[PDB]
């Protein structure tokens, strides 16, 4: 069906500028225009822009002066490019499409794109186990010292799901994040299945996978 | 620019209850808006477009009316996984704007927590930090209390919580509290407990162990 | 009431 599928999460310097990639699949960048909003704290959901079937764009007001939409029709992608950030532009940026070409109902959304501005320096996640020690035990993974969101955590390769919470991050006072992931399961499996938490964080392409056994 | 002015911020009701989202705009767009729901760590999703047009896929549970300035998205028997926040969208003039949401909450029956306490790993140790986290799952209402205590000394300012969004499947939500301290001040303790509060415990419960067993 | 980066949800 129709797809948007965006760049990953990354870092910005302040008074830089941000780069996000949308490719589409499902129809073509002829027929449809190719929205861009934004969801930040300070202000929700946000139109930034689109770019229309024939290669026309048009700007939100606030934005005409630094912001930039291109496209490669053969290729399926969509270019947002967008400068001199500051704090305050720290969002989640999406793509999208609309039902019809010329409207602005957006049925078809990227999965976003967490754009954090900070003079600070991209680090990796360590993880750490949180061990088993009614037959149901509870285990998981401490992924911690990271910078800056998001991090990525799945169980057994996206296996197992089922009573699987993953916290938000907080910051802490290093102004690094950390966050837990946990997965209660029977304790009976625990000599016979195998346990793996797959933490990957994506700005600093750091990816690791954490076996976890009673200790 | 038009103004979407959505009330309330936040709504908490029952399973099976019918419930209104309410989105008002600074002047008449007509029939020119769309709703969207957004699930915990989801994009938006389109349920109804101008006013009260159906959308493919969307359960029949979801409508929508109103025309000038008053408008409102309506779940005739609200279910658990209708968590999430609803958004309303003008497109009368442009540009188009978006209302700042409303959460929809799930009531539920007081459901105690399972309490888990996990030690720092011998990996951590190496590192010079010491995490001691305790876990608080599947529980409600929101409200606990997480009491940390170092050979019974209680613990200030060095723990942070972190609380999930409510559940889709059964309205509860689980809590991580972290202790955290300098290796060195975790070799020099021996006990180490979380003390859990909530309304569906008759009394507190503790779970504790003892750095090397 | 004010949206939060961390689990794309509102809060407060």
């Known amino acids: 069906q129709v797809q948007l599928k965006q760049s990953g999460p990354g870092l910005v310097q302040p008074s830089q500028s941000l780069s996000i990639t949308c490719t589409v699949s499902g129809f073509s960048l002829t027929n449809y225009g190719v929205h861009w909003v934004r969801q930040s704290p300070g202000k929700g959901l946000e139109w930034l822009g689109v770019?229309?079937?024939?290669?026309?764009?048009d700007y939100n007001t606030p934005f005409t002066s630094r912001l930039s939409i291109n496209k490669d029709n053969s290729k399926s992608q969509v270019f947002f490019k967008m400068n001199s950030l500051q704090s305050n532009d720290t969002a989640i940026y999406y793509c999208?499409?609309?039902?019809?070409?010329?409207?602005?109902?957006?049925?078809?959304w990227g999965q976003g794109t967490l754009v954090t501005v900070s003079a600070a320096s991209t680090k990796g996640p360590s993880v750490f186990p949180l061990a088993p020690s009614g037959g149901t035990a509870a285990l998981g993974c401490l992924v911690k010292d990271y910078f800056p969101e998001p991090v990525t955590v799945s169980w057994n390769s996206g296996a197992l799901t089922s009573g699987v919470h993953t916290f938000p991050a907080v910051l802490q006072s290093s102004g690094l994040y950390s966050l837990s992931s946990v997965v209660t399961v029977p304790s009976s499996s625990l000599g016979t299945q195998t346990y793996i938490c797959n933490v990957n964080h994506k700005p600093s392409n750091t990816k690791v996978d954490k076996r976890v056994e009673p200790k | 620019d038009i103004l979407l002015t959505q009330s309330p911020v936040i709504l908490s009701v029952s399973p099976g209850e019918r419930v209104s989202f309410s989105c008002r705009a600074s002047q008449s767009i007509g029939t020119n808006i769309h709703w969207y729901q957004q699930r915990t760590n989801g994009s938006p999703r389109l349920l109804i477009k101008?006013?009260?047009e159906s959308i493919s896929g969307i359960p029949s549970r979801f409508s929508g009316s109103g025309s000038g300035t008053d408008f409102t998205l309506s779940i005739n028997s609200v279910e658990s996984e209708d968590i999430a926040d609803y958004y309303c969208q003008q497109n009368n003039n442009w540009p188009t704007t978006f209302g700042a949401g409303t959460k929809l909450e799930l009531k539920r029956t007081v459901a105690a927590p399972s309490v888990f306490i996990f030690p720092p790993s011998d990996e951590q140790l190496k590192s010079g930090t010491a995490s001691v986290v305790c876990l608080l799952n599947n529980f409600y209402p929101r409200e606990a209390k997480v009491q940390w205590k170092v050979d019974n000394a209680l613990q200030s300012g060095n723990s942070q919580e972190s609380v999930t969004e409510q559940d889709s499947k059964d309205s509860t939500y689980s809590l991580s509290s972290t202790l955290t301290l300098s290796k060195a001040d975790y070799e020099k303790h021996k006990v180490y407990a979380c003390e859990v509060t909530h309304q569906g415990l008759s009394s507190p419960v503790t779970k504790s162990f003892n750095r090397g067993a | 009431g004010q949206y939060d980066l961390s689990t794309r949800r509102l809060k407060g």
């Open positions: 770019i229309w079937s024939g290669g026309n764009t």
């Open positions: 999208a499409r609309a039902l019809t070409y010329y409207d602005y109902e957006f049925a078809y």
């Open positions: 101008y006013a009260s």
